[PDB]
Amino acid sequence: MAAFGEAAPYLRKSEKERLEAQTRPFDLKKDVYVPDDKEEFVKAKILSREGGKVTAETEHGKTVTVKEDQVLQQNPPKFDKIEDMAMLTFLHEPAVLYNLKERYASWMIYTYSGLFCVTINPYKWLPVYNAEVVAAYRGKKRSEAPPHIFSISDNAYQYMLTDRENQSILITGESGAGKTVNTKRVIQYFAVIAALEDQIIQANPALEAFGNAKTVRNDNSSRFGKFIRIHFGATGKLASADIETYLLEKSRVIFQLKAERDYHIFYQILSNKKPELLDMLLITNNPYDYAFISQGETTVASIDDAEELMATDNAFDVLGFTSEEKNSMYKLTGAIMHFGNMKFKLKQREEQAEPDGTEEADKSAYLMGLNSADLLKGLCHPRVKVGNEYVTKGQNVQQVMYATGALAKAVYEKMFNWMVTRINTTLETKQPRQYFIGVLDIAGFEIFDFNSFEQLCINFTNEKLQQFFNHHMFVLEQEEYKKEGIIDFGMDLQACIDLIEKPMGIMSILEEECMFPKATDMTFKAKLYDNHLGKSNNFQKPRNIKGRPEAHFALIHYAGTVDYNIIGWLQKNKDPLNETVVDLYKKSSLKLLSNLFAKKGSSFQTVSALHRENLNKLMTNLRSTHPHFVRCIIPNETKSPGVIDNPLVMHQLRCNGVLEGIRICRKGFPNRILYGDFRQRYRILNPAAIPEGQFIDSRKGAEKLLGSLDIDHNQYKFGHTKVFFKAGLLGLLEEMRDERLS
């Protein structure tokens, strides 16, 4: 209830709408949720029952009969527009969809979903998210207060003060869904409860240009992860902040799908916004011309390349660095551009690929600062150290193309991590930094028609994050159930990670598949079918519906059956770091001298391997903290009023992992009702001859109730402070109460 503190009347939701919503006529014995084909879930009344086929009639109008297995049970109106979706007793997937769109009808932005804080995105002015309601959530807990990320930010600040532990906040959401507004909203609150906002808001647009590419859904789709630690003092005083970004996608730099784009910086220099870079970097003004920028899409609607450069020259004109590095970063990007155009023609009667067309790598060697001939000799003949004395190997045209892609993706990710440290030099102030309450952002677990290894690099990452959620829910639910005296849920996800992380798993089979002499992608699919078809329950053959182009294997993740396309994984998996060219990178007079300054994988380290190590390092960074999840979704394509398209919310219900934490709590008892709360409301179900009165102790006052409800012992579990019930009983507490209220 959001009175007492000057907040908006919808966030109250009491004495005007809730007390009349707890009595509206919705006969659940004749009202169900029917599955639509377009909305996919919508409320319907039923005229009469027939058994398996029920004659449904929805609010939009169809008199057809629908199978009983297709329709689902409908939530009561007393739990319609439910506040905490763990308190609801009929917790279907339309129990989040329909409740989210009708809480959107009252424009309830935030919503408790158990540990999740689900956030729809309407667009208006918000009186609630400013100072006088910071006064209405300072110290206010989860249960009594209405939903708010200043409330869970003050819970993270609360256990930050009390538990003496690094608290963390893992925002899951995509760009364009107000994600910059979401992160600004998170970091706005810590300065208020303190007694570098403009550096975060200034630091973001160049970050958006170096690391936020285009997937099919999002025209500024996130690829990497953010991790903004707002460092504190000893007793909760805001000290500083640092960022350390994870999982910048290498294959995104090199290999671009035609419905996808690269990172924006190359397109900015290809834009004619600044001509001095075009004279400076020897660029032919054309994205179609370059081999890196022609495998994908040149440009799409709703984005402008000169606006992207307008972001980067604003962030580059003023920040902590000097003016020469503004030239240097562009030197490295246009230095990446001239790599791939080199032919590397095979010698006659040999295998060693000699560049004879040496005009474009000459332009590269002018752009970097490397020598012209030494770069070509180093790419052509990599010299390695054996025992004491160096020997050279040859190469063929294929391995030198993987070298000239691998050095580019490596120098781009190390340049971007370097830039994260350079922004970190600005963002860090000399206050004593202790016990961060840092907030991570990451790309969403995204399911396209072209799930590739790029998509696997998103999917297994968010898979492991969801694995941290399942254990983290299980320890808390275990804590309340051991307080009350009443298989792990992470195992429900573990098998999929068992299919992906463990050796003789799909990432491992993809890694070792490269090592063979003549192993193509068809041989790789033949090997996956050899090792896992029927051997593991997750792995299954891909059904193709509705004319997908091609699907090669399917993994039933927590979002369900997700196909994949093998073709081209062996080319994009490789990262052979050519060592002598890294030596020439050290020798060149540029930033790179500072950038690129039992062994493992000198010639065979793959994108899957560094994904595995960076994800494990993010995990051991995250297992040392304490999470507080935030979800954030876009309404539809238009920044719009209430025209929310239910396929998008039903898809991001499963892609954010919200429906998982919805269904994990259902396997225990989610119906968490207090004894006197069971007597003030549901003693009406089957009372004695005397009304309530408060003359029996509420544990025995509910034992008097359950001793006459005709409910068996296996349905409920009795405790000490509360009593719990299985999902599917607090609608049974009203079907006979409406017989009492008939």
Swiss-Prot record:
Residue segments, region Actin-binding: 615-637, 717-731
Transmembrane segments: none
Compartments (UniProt record): Cytoplasm, Myofibril; Cytoplasm, Myofibril, Sarcomere
UniProt modified residues of type N6,N6,N6-trimethyllysine: K124
Domain Myosin motor: 80-738
Phosphothreonine modified-residue sites: T358
Residues engaged in binding ATP: G173, E174, S175, G176, A177, G178, K179, T180
Residue pairs linked by disulfide bridges in the UniProt entry: none
Free-text function comment from the UniProt entry: Myosins are actin-based motor molecules with ATPase activity essential for muscle contraction. Forms regular bipolar thick filaments that, together with actin thin filaments, constitute the fundamental contractile unit of skeletal and cardiac muscle.
Domain notes: Limited proteolysis of myosin heavy chain produces 1 light meromyosin (LMM) and 1 heavy meromyosin (HMM). HMM can be further cleaved into 2 globular subfragments (S1) and 1 rod-shaped subfragment (S2).
Protein family (similarity comment): Belongs to the TRAFAC class myosin-kinesin ATPase superfamily. Myosin family.
Protein name: Myosin-7
Species name: Sus scrofa (Pig)
Gene: MYH7
